[PDB]
Design an enzyme around this catalytic site. Structure first.
Site, PDB file in Angstrom:
ATOM      1  N   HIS A 131      -1.261  -3.747   5.241  1.00  0.00           N
ATOM      2  CA  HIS A 131      -0.870  -3.369   6.594  1.00  0.00           C
ATOM      3  C   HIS A 131      -2.116  -3.266   7.458  1.00  0.00           C
ATOM      4  O   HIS A 131      -3.246  -3.233   6.962  1.00  0.00           O
ATOM      5  CB  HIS A 131      -0.101  -2.041   6.619  1.00  0.00           C
ATOM      6  CG  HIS A 131      -0.893  -0.903   6.071  1.00  0.00           C
ATOM      7  ND1 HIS A 131      -1.407   0.103   6.867  1.00  0.00           N
ATOM      8  CD2 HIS A 131      -1.321  -0.650   4.811  1.00  0.00           C
ATOM      9  CE1 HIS A 131      -2.091   0.943   6.111  1.00  0.00           C
ATOM     10  NE2 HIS A 131      -2.065   0.494   4.868  1.00  0.00           N
TER      11      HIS A 131
ATOM     12  N   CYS B 284       0.845  -1.187   0.000  1.00  0.00           N
ATOM     13  CA  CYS B 284       0.000   0.000   0.000  1.00  0.00           C
ATOM     14  C   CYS B 284       0.885   1.243   0.000  1.00  0.00           C
ATOM     15  O   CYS B 284       1.947   1.281   0.632  1.00  0.00           O
ATOM     16  CB  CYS B 284      -0.953   0.025   1.202  1.00  0.00           C
ATOM     17  SG  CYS B 284      -1.864   1.627   1.372  1.00  0.00           S
TER      18      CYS B 284
ATOM     19  N   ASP C 121       0.615   3.769   1.542  1.00  0.00           N
ATOM     20  CA  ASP C 121       0.652   4.415   2.845  1.00  0.00           C
ATOM     21  C   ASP C 121       2.076   4.800   3.226  1.00  0.00           C
ATOM     22  O   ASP C 121       3.008   4.004   3.078  1.00  0.00           O
ATOM     23  CB  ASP C 121       0.056   3.476   3.897  1.00  0.00           C
ATOM     24  CG  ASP C 121      -0.237   4.177   5.199  1.00  0.00           C
ATOM     25  OD1 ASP C 121       0.737   4.569   5.879  1.00  0.00           O
ATOM     26  OD2 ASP C 121      -1.435   4.320   5.549  1.00  0.00           O
TER      27      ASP C 121
HETATM   28 ZN    ZN Z   1      -3.195   1.407   3.255  1.00  0.00          ZN
END
Ligand code: ZN
Ligand code: RUB
Ligand code: RUB
Ligand code: ZN
Ligand code: ZN
Lengths: 462, 461
Positions: B196, B128, B130
């Site tokens: 995650h 991801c 992120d």
């Molecule tokens: Zn994420």
């Protein structure tokens, strides 16, 4: 000065004048920087007033200083205010002290009108390009008394043909009714001059932006307007009416002029001209009267075809005068102005400023209608977005309109015309406004007598 | 310390993370000192000298030289300082190789060989996007960055069709150059999806692309993995398949968990092997045995009889991740205090080759604003809380990779950057006009290992 025809005393008086007006504008920012640093100190409002009065000679708006603590001292507005007040003191002293010694009734003003009639011209109406770098063309470049000339500046020298024709009827009328400038049945002509410009040092980028910095183009459009005015007069009035024409250029690097000496009927050529640099050298070694006699010979030989003798005398006189301006730049500016581009202190918009005669002081844009003159104002704003906004300073706009004081209502109409221009300016640059980077002062001048302009509004409000 | 932790590696990586984060965080404190001085006579001189000492570069002079008019333009200085800090950061990544994992590094050569022995000729990872996972490769799994394709996406939702195209490009290079190995050799392309979760606050600190539901993030990542495999198997003749690996990572502790697969990618979503149980299982063992026990654990957690090389490689990632667990216990008390978003700037475009630190960059993948403006809006809202809350602009760095062999690709990439800039300036005109948003345009030649290139900015003089 080096040239035997140069007026060394005049170069001195002219140079002191230019230096003093520029210094008044250039000391604004150092004074305002010093003030900016004090804005948190104790008696700041009082201290600032006394500082301004002592170093600028005028006070600052009380409510700006009073309100600095809320956000910070509003230097943008203070800058505009100071430019406006300096314009206003400059203007005042012009009308009151006549630094150029050319006001109505002055010896040199009357003298030039007499010499002009001696050459067979009863009015000299000259359109330079509105480029701020030409603002001194009449007073410095041609050493003419400003009140003996009709100065009508336009971008690229594109004057209004129809309005010129009307100025000709006015002129004819005062001749018939008042014998001013002279009797009506004297064999004199209205002489309309167009004055283009070019850069010898950077012929390609630093020329006339309105003609893309193409010297040949600016000269062609200039001449084309002259010819149209002349044709307009001949076709509009009986009994062989006509005007005389003169096409000229000036080099914004050296202030040397070049002239396309015309033949009797206005015939001029765009590719042939007499350059003042060349005239200056041909005479540099002679006694004044012999130098003068050579200038006439040179002007005479340079004529496109057989020229009118009065035209030779006048044109010769202009070269003689420009020689002083040539020495002027050589003796005070190393032979070439360091500010080759635009370096003006404020934008002037509306009618030509009677009182601005200094190189690079005012970016002028003519406009009698807003919806008709926006383009030139836009060029001027973008110039100042570089000169001023890039340093954090606003664009100081000074609106001018002449009016005939002797006509009832005229002043109020001009004041009301100032306000529609301001309203139009505010609409057109709405962002620059909002941010504090554009301000306007409104001014009007009674053209019916020699008296200062007067301020009648402003975008700075309390 | 665990018997399998690389102590000195943990120090070197810590020294790197704290160095770069110091460079960025020293900015505000310096700008606070300058703000105090802006009315002094020698302001410009004293500010330049403070900045050189503190940040190691000087400031744009126009902004200092005109502070007396408007006041000192902190929003623009702050953005400019973040950009300049990013440039120095990035340039030094390619110059110094802090991770010891650039092309041709011993570590990279070692791992490329190890991947081949395990039966894999390319390792393609989608975490991801992120910001809390930007260090997954270099810190979390301790892999040389250059031995790995990293393809980050919001919620690990990578482009199935473009991954097939990367498989095709990989096979073609095996056919024509035998690089990394001959085409006939019995190896497989390996695609990994790294999701995650938050063990400390699972309800709000999870993967926001999937509403912080752990199951949804795990299952969408697998859905893409399957779809990629199915796509290869359906689009080409003969053998034609790929290997799969679904992994997650706890953003509080950096422990990974592996869904160990059967040979054909059979993955169970409800059963995993967590590196924390691995950690505890091997903690009392000497190293040699601990390695053996990690092997038997990965073997035993397979969904069905696993591939031998998959078991070996996954065991190495567990062995590697155990150091990162110790890392977070050493230097972050066993749980990062920046449990959530603390990024220093937004990155948009293609993944940043040089960005490998946690909570440094909020990355939004996009080819155009018209697509994934949703993902960009998320970052912009976040930086409203991080930066606009305290008066600071939102700094955006646009990045596009281009093939520096295609004639004019660099030109095309630059113009792609300005295309993004225009679109951003149009999406947030309030912030852009209030000077609360700025963009830096960077392009990177992806055909060799040199630094990205700054090609324009919303900060203009
Ligand atoms: Zn994420
Ligand atoms: O010459 C002009 C026009 O522009 P500039 O101000 O630049 O010279 C003035 O109108 C003079 O006052 C003319 O005199 P009068 O109005 O008496 O005819
Ligand atoms: O996946 C990556 C790196 O991922 P990230 O950039 O996110 O670290 C690519 O293999 C190369 O780096 C791209 O081109 P190049 O071979 O020039 O690096
Ligand atoms: Zn202050
Ligand atoms: Zn011009």
């Amino acid at each position: 000065s080096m040239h035997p025809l140069t007026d060394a005393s005049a170069n001195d008086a002219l140079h002191a004048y230019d230096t003093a007006v520029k210094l008044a504008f250039d000391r604004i920012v150092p004074v305002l920087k010093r003030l900016s640093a004090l804005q948190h100190e104790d008696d700041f409002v009082g201290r600032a007033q006394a500082i301004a009065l002592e170093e600028l000679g005028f006070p600052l708006p009380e409510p700006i200083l009073d309100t600095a603590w809320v956000s910070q001292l509003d230097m943008r507005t203070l800058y505009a205010w100071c430019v406006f007040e300096t314009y206003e003191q400059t203007s005042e002293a012009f009308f009151r002290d006549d630094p150029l010694q050319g006001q109505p009734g002055s010896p040199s003003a009357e003298a030039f009108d007499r010499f002009l009639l001696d050459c067979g011209f009863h009015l000299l109406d000259i359109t330079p390009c509105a480029d701020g770098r030409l603002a001194h063309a009449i007073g410095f470049g041609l050493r003419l008394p400003f009140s003996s000339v009709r100065r009508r500046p336009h971008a690229g020298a594109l004057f209004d043909v129809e309005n010129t024709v009307n100025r000709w009827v006015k002129t004819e009328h005062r001749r018939y009714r008042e014998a001013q400038p002279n009797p009506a049945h004297a064999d004199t002509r209205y002489l309309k001059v167009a004055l283009y410009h070019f850069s010898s040092l950077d012929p390609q980028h630093e020329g006339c932006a309105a003609h893309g910095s193409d010297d040949a183009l600016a000269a062609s459009c200039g001449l084309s307007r002259l010819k149209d005015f002349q044709q307009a007069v001949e076709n509009s009035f009986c009994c062989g009416a006509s005007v005389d024409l003169l096409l000229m250029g000036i080099d914004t690097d050296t202030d040397a002029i070049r002239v396309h000496v015309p033949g009797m009927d206005g015939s001029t050529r765009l590719d042939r001209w007499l350059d003042a640099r060349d005239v200056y050298d041909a005479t540099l070694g002679l006694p004044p009267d012999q130098a003068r006699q050579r200038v006439s010979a040179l002007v005479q030989e340079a004529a496109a075809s057989v020229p009118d003798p009065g035209m030779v005398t006048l044109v010769a006189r202009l070269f003689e005068h420009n020689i002083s301006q040539i020495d002027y730049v050589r003796q005070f500016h190393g032979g070439a102005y360091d500010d080759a581009g635009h370096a003006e202190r404020f934008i002037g918009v509306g009618i030509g400023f009677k009182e601005i005669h200094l190189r690079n002081l005012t970016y002028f844009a003519y406009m009698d209608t807003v919806e008709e003159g926006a383009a030139d104002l836009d060029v001027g704003v973008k110039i100042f977005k570089g000169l001023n906004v890039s340093r954090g300073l606003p664009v100081p706009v000074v609106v001018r309109f002449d009016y005939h004081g002797q006509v009832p209502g005229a002043r109020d109409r001009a004041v009301r015309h100032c306000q529609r221009v301001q309203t139009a300016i505010e609409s057109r640059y709405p962002e620059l406004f909002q941010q504090g980077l554009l301000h306007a002062l409104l001014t009007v001048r009674d053209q019916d007598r020699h008296t200062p302009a007067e301020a009648v509004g402003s975008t700075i409000v309390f």
